[model samples]
Target chain A: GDDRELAILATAENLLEDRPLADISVDDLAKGAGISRPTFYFYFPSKEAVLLTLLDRVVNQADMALQTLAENPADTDRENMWRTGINVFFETFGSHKAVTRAGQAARATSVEVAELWSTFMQKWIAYTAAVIDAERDRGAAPRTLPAHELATALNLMNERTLFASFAGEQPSVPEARVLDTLVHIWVTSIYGE
Target chain B: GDDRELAILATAENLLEDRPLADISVDDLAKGAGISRPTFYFYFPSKEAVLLTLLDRVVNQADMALQTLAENPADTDRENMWRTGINVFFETFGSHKAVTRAGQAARATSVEVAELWSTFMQKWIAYTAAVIDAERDRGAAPRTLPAHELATALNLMNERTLFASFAGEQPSVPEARVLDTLVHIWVTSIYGE
Candidate 1:
């Protein structure tokens, strides 16, 4: 049972590398997993369920990057802390670009995935806000907008900018520029430098 | 010919008030227009084409708001210029909420609408960067990120935040604060107060 479940997750992730989740059929998932359709159903009720698991894994890994910053408020180099935090986000999402995008697109229609995505984002927002609050407490950053609003705006900026890059929409943000571009906006907007 | 086309467009727009474009059928469109189904095809090839026409009209009106700010560089009240310009965008998009949402949702699947959306966004980004350049030239604001990248990040923020609010996404941005919140971020990020 464990092996079959792993197969389903791995197959779906690989297929997403080439096509959207919408394009990959359930039968292909089953065949790729070397399991019967009934067996596939036993492991996951829908392909979205499989994606939910994969998304859970990747988001957990990505959140740790934020968690490190939140846990350590005394970093001497705040800019490096921000740079490293954002870099992990870009790398984690970039490495799992396919699942990352597919989950984002699915939020429009899939109730379950939407809930999961919302939970993950809310957590990230809170973590980022905590960091900002810490900076203000330490007199390291200026208090401009309310911490929550500022956090929400910056987090959503990261979400949209990263999603656009991965999806390959026109008027693309240059790949080389994404990391420094994001870090600059966050540090300058929050720190007033 | 003009009357039928107007009727068709009116019907589609009204129907979207209650239901998504995907739920509204060609037959429904024709019936609402009081025209035969064949006549609908005579005016437009598909429902997407009708949406395209409507989107074009709305985007032109919205773009004019940005153009107003771009045309005038000597306004002593730059903050007022930003507040007025952003208010117009929110009011314009908010008034046509349903069509704005449908067109945004369609960008993934509708090529024409996507093209129009991209073209509109690029134009706005350029206009925004121009304003930033003017501010720096006048010695009123400091340059942080490159004007173009800063514009893209901020513009995409507005687009995503507005779309999310209209779509009734969770963690809703407070409607009363939408205009002021956006203006605050823009002014602070650019003017560094």
Candidate 2:
């Protein structure tokens, strides 16, 4: 069982490295994994299942980063939270570029994939909305816009930033500076000086 | 020659009523218009060429609407400009839904078509930027963000609005309401009151 799991993961890693996720085929994965096609199918029902497994791993890493922020509440300041959150997110993306690219390709071509992406985004938005709501309750931030809209805005900003970065259009600055600018826009837009 | 041209136009009009532009073939067009396949080729190089001809006609209609706006410059306020412009745009799209849908599908799926759409968008952005710049110069608007960023925001709003509208998510209200919301956001953000 362990050997079969390892083989499947290895094949997925290799395929993701070579091409976008949508382009990788189950047969190719089986060939790369040195397993029978039926065996590969037994382990993973679909490419999306395999991708979801990979995404779960990345999401777990982000969760750990969030946990760290919670432990050190002093480090959960606006700048620190933004910097740490974005860093964890981008670092995960950087490490799994192939898989991320695959997900993006799938998202572009398939309605099912887009819906999957939208679900994931909605979860992230809910989390961000909670954070915004907490800040407003604490009187640290103004309650100008509803938390959900603010959350949606933050999610959009994050997506736009990543899209720009992937397209090689992002400014060459420290990650902290990028976070600062994003947070600055968010804060100023919500609560004027 | 004029009669032949009118015949071709009438055939195109009839074909688009039920079928999307991408679904229509040149041979079918020729057959429907009682012309040889080769004759269709002689008249238009490709399906896109024929669609572009249709687009030219729609653009002429758009120009007439713009001329009307120009005649009453006082009515060219942000709200009115957006309302009138989007009304005319949607009216044209409604009349030629097939063509507009085909153009958008091609823009998303084909590089050449995407380039064509991008070129049009870039020009539209420039034109909108000029309007925002003039407002700032007249002290009617704050010069907070660069004109280009404002243009980008407007373009992004337009994209989101169209995506929602065409996807049939929010359709009961006239398209002008969508444009009004977009223009309101732009004005509010830019002025920062």
Candidate 3:
């Protein structure tokens, strides 16, 4: 079982280096992993299952980072909170660009993958909404839109920025620039100034 | 030639009624149009070409409406421009919903269709950017984001609204509601406080 698992992961890694996940065939994966075709079936039901596993790993890592941020509350500076949170998100994504790229491609290609990504996004929205709600309660953030709307906006920005970057547009924009743009939209929309 | 062209259009309409463009076969089109398969090929290179012809019709209708709006410029009110433009767009799409839907599905499923759609969108974006540029020139809009950025935002809103409607999500909300949300974002972002 361990050998089969390692083989699958190795095959995925190798295939990912050459082409996107959507283009990678199961047969190619089996060959790369040094496993029989049937053995791939023994470990994973489908190629999508392997991608789901990879996505789960990325989400878990993000969750851990979010938890750490939540536990270690920053000073009362609302701007600082926005800056730090955006930095964490951008950095995590920058480090795992390949995974992010593959995940996006997969989502566009298959309804099953899109649904999985949407569920992940919904949870992230809820997490973000909670933070904005707290800031509003503390009078640190204005409440022009409801928490859910804020969450949706944040989620949209997150996805759009990554999508834009991966599409070879604005790939080298500083994290600070992205953070400032998001903050400007958020703060201006909320405070109306 | 005229008869064959009419047959192709008729075949496309009938095929769209029962199934998406991606599902329609060459044989079905030939049989429905009362032409041989090779004859169908003679008129149009591929099924996508047939769909592109339908799209071209929709785009021409939209362009006419846009030209009307431009001639009777609504420069003072950003919301009015959005309302007029989006209404025309939705009306045009509504008239050709079946063809548009099939074209969208085909774009998702086939690289060739996707490229065609991408090229179409690029032109659409250029048209939107020109509108935004005209508004900026009149000193009615912000110079903070470029015309292209505004175009991108509007394009994203179109995608959101179309997909939401197609998926039957929030079906109770009129298309106007989607237009209003888009206009609100555009207005507020361009004119802060």
Candidate 4:
């Protein structure tokens, strides 16, 4: 049961790395997975489902990385912590570029994917807010903007900057400068320079 | 000639305020404009064209407002200049919320709209870069991040934060806290605490 499903998901992720989900048909997915069309339908209802599952995996990985970062004791330096955290976002999303792109494109059409993404963002924002709150409690960061509000803005910045870079859109910061700029802003904004 | 074309554009803008462009048919636009479908065809090729024209108008207004701010002599205070400049974005884009929303959504489908938006973003980034560079030249702001890099990140934050708020996306900063939070980040990140 799991063999075919896992194969299909893996194949889809690999294929998406090369091309968009819109261009990858069910037949292509089945063939790439070494399965028949009928078998592909048996494991997944549509290509959309496959993409959604893949996006879920990416988000799950990000969540675990964040959790791990939160648990580590040596990562107490705020600037280093912020850099590591933002890097998690860039690496996780950057590696699965096509899947992330598909999820963003499909966000307008698919309610289920949109809701999943929304939930993921809510969790991330809450995590960031808690981090800010802890920083304030430790007197590390001054109480400037509310924790939740500042977290939301910072998170949105990370989200947008990464997406624009991945999509190769205009006005995106140079690739060389993204992480440093984001980290600088996060540190400076929270712990004033 | 101009009457019918302007009416069509105005009607589409008003209708988009009520609902998305996809939901509003060409016939509805024509009806609202007090013109026949054939006359609507004469003035515009399709509803998409109408939307593009409307979005162009919105962008033009924003550019003019920004230019005006640049020209105004009383806006010498960096903090107040930043506030007024950002308020121009919120006011111009916010007032035509539906058109801005449509432009963002249509970016994927229409090459023309996408190029227009790209050009607008490039112009904004350059303008912001100049402002940052001027600040450094005057020794008003410290050199932390590179001027262009910092400008790109800050402008991206404003773009992302404003779009999320307008689109009512989750993890968006609250309505009341948006301006203050964005201003805080800009001020702290550029000018120090």
Candidate 5:
């Protein structure tokens, strides 16, 4: 039972590499999975559910990757510490280009995707805010804005920058430029390394 | 002669408030304007073209508004001058929200819209970068990144923040807070105006 469900999701995901989530129809998914369209409905309400199921998986993986940074870089300096986190974040995003495109594009059509993206942003904002708060505790003020507000702006900057880079809708800056630009914004806004 | 074409564009703009561009059909648009779909073709080939024409108008108006800032605000001071520019920007964005919504939402299905948005952003980046370069002529460093890069980042920040606030997708920061937060980033990033 669960095996068949997993099979369907895998089938749909493999198709995403060649086409966007919006371009994939229920019939295409069902046909690829060797199930009837009605049976596909039994497994998942819509294609977005498949995308969301996949998105949740990616978010969890990235969260796990983020856990590595909680150590305060005991053996690492501030620049190296942030460099490590940004690399993992970029890797997670880089690997899941299709899913990220779907999530960003689907926001206009799906209330659920919009909420998930927004809630996801807030969680990151809170995480980064606390990260900066720790820095201030160590004496890092005159930072451009308050911790929470600055973090929100920085996260929003990353969100838009990465979205454009990954979506293939618009030409993006080189990867190093995109990452370094974000790192510079974050580092400086937090009173520098 | 031109009145009927203008009416059709106006009709589409009004209906945009109720639904996304994807949900609206040619028949519905034609009906709203009291014309047949064939006649819509006579005036404009597709809804995308109508949307594009409307978008062009708003961009022009904003360009005109921005001209007021060319003098660099001697008596007004940097913060208030910049604040004034941003307020006019917010006004333009708020007033043309429906067109903005349609243009942004339509980017997924239409390449033309994506190019248009990116191209439009470049214009803003150029404008803001020039605005910052003037400050640096008076000398400011390094200011986050180079002026062009820093300006690109700032404009991207404004784009995402304004989008979230206006799109009715997620909860938005209050207007006062959003404006203040954006100004803070610009002022501080440029080494205090």
Candidate 6:
């Protein structure tokens, strides 16, 4: 069972390289994993459940880059931390670009996926907020907006920007410039530099 | 047939109020619009086609809310244009939040929707880039990055942030805060304010 589960996961991750998660059928998933349809059902309820499982694993395991700088993005030592972490995010996400995009797209049609993506984004917002909240407590950050508001907006900027940058066919812009534009916003808004 | 097409569009828009665009199917769409499934296809290639049509209508008629300021975001006389246009975008999209969210989500699953959305956002990026270009041309804006790349990133920020804020549940931030945060980014990054 463990082997089959791993196989299913691996198969999905591999298969996503070729086509959309929505386009792949349960039969395709099962067959790709070298299991029967019944076996696929026994392990997961649906194809969406497979994606949910895959994404849950990604959420739990992926090193959410940039905690240090999210805390003190303006610090001289920590300022460049934003740059490294942003690249790591692109690296981690780019490593799984197919799944990342498919999961993002699945949110539209699948309630379960949508909820998970929302929770995932909320976690980022909270992480970013904690940093700002602490900075504001010490009068190091701006108070023009609440910590959560700033964090939410900034996090959404990262979310949307990355999603657009890594899209398959015609991404909004190339990756190099996307990183600069994003880091620029983060530094300017948070540090006023 | 044209009459039936009108009925279908009207029903889909009405139904979107209660659920996502992907939740409605050809059967439901047909029955609700008082037609057969085959006739539904006669009107739209798919349910997404229906949403695309609705989105196209919204885009065409919404006045885009910021053509004036997108031309010159840092106008010394119209320093507050950023706030005005940002508010207008939220209002127009907020007026049809249901469709807006659905269309945004559909972009993930449907290539047609994605391209249409891309074209739509490119229209915005082009509008925003012109301002950045003129700003640079006459010593108005920074040229650290190409105007098109900067404009694309900024526009994507609005697109992603607004979609998140207007979600049916668990929105990232309040409407007012989201607008302020967005305008702040635009102003600081472009105007160095």
CAPRI-wise, candidate 6 is: medium
User: Per-residue alpha-carbon lDDT of model 4 for B11-31, expressed as tens digits?
Assistant: 888888888887999999999
Cα lDDT tens digits for candidate 5, A61-123: 777788766654532377666667777778898798777777677777877777777777777
**For each candidate, what is the lDDT?**
0.83, 0.60, 0.66, 0.86, 0.74, 0.74
**Top model number, DockQ:** 4
- Predicted candidate 6 versus true structure: per-residue lDDT over B1-193, tens digit per residue: 5889889988998899898765778888899899899878877888878998988877765554465445553546433665776676888888888778777767656777877776767777786787677777887556666778777777778877887778734647776578878887776677553
Per-residue lDDT tens digits for candidate 6, residues A1-193, read: 6999999998998888888776789899899889899999889988888888888777654444444434443655434655776666667676677778877777766788878877877777777777667666887666666767777777777777787677733547787677887777776677552
Going through the candidates in the order shown, the clash numbers are: 0, 1, 0, 0, 1, 2
Q: Ten-residue segment with the worst summed lDDT in candidate 4 chain B?
A: B69-78
Instruction: Provide the TM-score of chain A alone for each candidate, in the order shown.
Output: 0.93, 0.76, 0.82, 0.94, 0.88, 0.85
TM-score for each predicted model, relative to the true structure? 0.91, 0.62, 0.77, 0.95, 0.83, 0.85
Looking at model 2, the pairs that clash are A21-A102
Q: Scored by Cα lDDT, where does model 5 land? A: 0.74
Q: What is the C-alpha DockQ of each candidate?
A: 0.49, 0.14, 0.22, 0.73, 0.38, 0.56
How many clashing residue pairs, candidate 3? 0
Off by over 4 Å in 5: A1-7, A25-42, A71-83, A143-146, A168-171, B22-41, B71-85, B143-146
Clashing pairs in 6: B135-B140, B135-B141
Model 4 over residues A1-193: C-alpha lDDT tens digits?
A: 8988889999988887788777899999898788999999888899999988988999999999988987877476778988998999999998888888878888877888989988989999998899889888988888878888899999988988888888777878776678998998998899883
Clashes of 6: 2
Model 1 chain A lowest lDDT segment of ten: A66-75
Deviating ranges (above 4 Å) for candidate 1: none
lDDT of 5 at B19: 80
| Distance from true location, Cα of B111 in model 5, Å | 1.7
Output the TM-score of candidate 6: 0.85
Ranking by lDDT: 4, 1, 6, 5, 3, 2
* Root mean square deviation (Cα) for candidate 5: 3.6
